[PDB]
């Protein structure tokens, strides 16, 4: 039936008006001296606790004064304000006490809202505290989310004071999990040692349970260092995705010992012409084809941001016109390998160029043309506040401008107006630029001297920042004139490119190049074969970030050999 909602809202606003002037107040709740007159029906039809307390037919339904203990006055006031309206005003300062009061009062709506709010607000500073909270209050979803977050950044959060005050079950369930993102077992060993020495008089009996969870006879990646590295070129990654899989889980190499440099191909293309905005991850070591889910809700024109902790992110976005410009934010995880929805921005960034300047992602322009107050708007990415504070905006429209941080100072070279993009002073001190006013200048983290190869015209200009000098190398080897499909990459902190200059058909000629700085010469690194690597585009996002091949969808879907000579 179409239950009337027009009468429902008038009755609700009338009940609120009556409650504000204290009419028909039949119950009086006493919390730590403070009195609150209220109606029994509203508390019953909102909280299952009050419903059971009133429907019992005892003196609680007859006495007008009810003393509620272990309940905060502010939380009870917020609950009543929800009981008489339904809108919840939650904040990061009083969300845990509100959730405690709700679970003590059993308000399904408030409980679910606080649960989802805590889930969508797990950061790397409260992960352990929220995990302890969920363990104390038995919230399985929040507990699992906080456990995954701790496993993702264990080496960064095991120093917090909340980690040493954890219970025994939390320790034995965190250490036993094979999802610990640690490069060496010594980190987990020292974490267990500091945990057991934090409070010795109460944990002296748990030393056996502590030592039984740390893998000592694992010898994951040291045994390969003992015998030799003798294998096909860098085939240690194949052993990673082999020995790990088949393991009794007691000597298993932790997930952090599987993290290996991976080519995160965001908004990439595939052999299928329909999937021209899909995603195919690649390993520059094991030479294997993996699958990726770069588009979350078919979100295109986004901006990949890999943090130093290897956490790929996205900015702005564009859903297919139901392109419908959207702002839904998404964070690519590594353990679950999924995009996490969060607070949307105020400006739709069209394929933005952003980096973690000073460990802090900034929304360096990466928009369109039509107003400096609307587009080209550098913002800030509040990590713990999960907010998007606006900062000094980019003066002119600068598109296809690779954003590269240099000495904790963004040095984004534009068409022909480079500035001193400051991550602290937020100013545009015109920095040494060039004379070629062109964009499409591919550049990755190349250290002191950056190289903005590209111009759609592939001059390898040297970008000296310390000496503030301006030299030049040469050009990309081609024929009469090759097509500039420069894709500057940074594999394991190196000066390389993914030039896809199509020559003799074969989709695009994917040839990686070796850039010299001390010799300042011109060489070639590797040559990605087209037998597996099919159409991938000419200027698509190709970030490089350490990722687990075990968690990466292991799906090649690309037949190698073709063109049989049988005819």
């Amino acid at each position: 039936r179409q239950i009337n909602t027009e009468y429902a809202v008038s009755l609700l606003e009338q009940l609120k008006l009556f409650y504000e002037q204290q009419l028909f107040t039949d119950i009086v709740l006493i919390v730590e001296g403070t009195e609150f007159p209220c109606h029994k029906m509203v508390l019953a039809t909102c909280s299952s606790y009050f419903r059971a307390m009133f429907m019992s037919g005892l003196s609680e339904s007859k006495q007008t004064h009810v003393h509620l203990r272990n309940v905060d006055a502010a939380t009870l006031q917020i609950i009543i304000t929800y009981a008489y309206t339904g809108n919840l005003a939650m904040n990061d300062s009083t969300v845990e006490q509100l959730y405690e009061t709700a679970c003590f009062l059993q308000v399904e709506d408030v409980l679910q809202r606080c649960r989802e709010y805590l889930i969508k607000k797990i950061n790397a500073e409260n992960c352990v505290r929220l995990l302890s909270f969920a363990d104390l209050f038995s919230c399985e979803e929040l507990k699992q989310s906080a456990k995954r977050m701790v496993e993702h950044k264990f080496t960064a959060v095991y120093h917090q004071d909340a980690f040493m005050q954890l219970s025994h079950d939390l320790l034995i369930d965190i250490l036993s999990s094979d999802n610990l993102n640690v490069e060496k077992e010594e980190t987990v060993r020292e974490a267990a040692m500091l945990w057991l020495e934090y409070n010795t008089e109460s944990r002296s009996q748990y030393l056996s349970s502590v030592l039984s969870q740390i893998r000592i006879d694992a010898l994951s990646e040291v045994t390969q260092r003992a015998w030799f590295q003798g294998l096909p070129p860098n085939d240690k990654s194949v052993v990673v995705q082999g020995l790990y899989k088949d393991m009794p889980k007691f000597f298993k190499p932790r997930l952090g010992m599987t993290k290996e440099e991976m080519m995160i191909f965001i908004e990439a293309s595939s052999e299928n012409p329909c999937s021209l905005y899909s995603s195919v991850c690649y390993s520059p070591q094991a030479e294997k084809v993996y699958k990726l889910c770069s588009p979350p809700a078919d979100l295109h024109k986004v901006g990949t941001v890999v943090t130093p902790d290897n956490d790929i992110y996205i900015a702005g976005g564009q859903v297919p016109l139901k392109f419908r410009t959207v702002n839904c934010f998404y964070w690519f995880d590594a353990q679950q390998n999924t995009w996490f929805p969060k607070t949307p921005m105020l400006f739709v960034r069209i394929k933005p160029s952003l980096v973690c300047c000073e460990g802090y992602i900034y929304a360096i322009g990466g928009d369109s043309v039509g107003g400096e107050l609307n587009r080209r708007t550098v913002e800030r990415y509040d990590t713990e506040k999960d907010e998007w504070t606006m900062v000094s905006p980019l003066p002119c429209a600068w598109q296809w401008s690779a954003a590269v941080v240099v000495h904790d100072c963004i040095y984004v070279m534009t068409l022909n107006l480079m500035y001193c993009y400051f991550p602290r002073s937020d100013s545009w001190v015109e920095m040494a630029m060039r004379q070629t006013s062109r964009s499409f200048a591919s550049a990755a983290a190349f250290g002191d001297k950056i190289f903005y190869i590209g111009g759609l015209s592939v001059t390898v200009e040297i970008y000296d920042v310390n000496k503030n000098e301006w030299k030049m190398a040469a050009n990309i080897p081609a024929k009469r004139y090759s097509d500039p499909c420069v894709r500057a990459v940074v594999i394991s902190n190196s000066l390389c490119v993914f030039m896809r200059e199509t020559h003799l058909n074969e989709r695009a000629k994917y040839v990686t190049y070796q850039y010299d700085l001390e010799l300042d010469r011109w060489s070639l690194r590797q040559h990605i074969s087209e037998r597996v690597l099919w159409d991938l585009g000419r200027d698509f996002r190709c970030t490089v970030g350490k990722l687990y091949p075990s968690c990466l969808e292991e799906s090649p879907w690309k037949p190698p050999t073709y063109l049989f000579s049988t005819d």
Binding site: A478, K479, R480, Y481, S482, D483, H503, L504
Partner: peptide, 20 residues
């Protein structure tokens, strides 16, 4: 042909050099 046309030799210009 995968070098001159790749540089920017328009097909119309190629037809002029193919017609003289």
């Amino acid at each position: 042909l995968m070098w001159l046309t790749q540089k920017g030799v328009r097909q119309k210009k190629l037809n002029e050099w193919l017609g003289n």
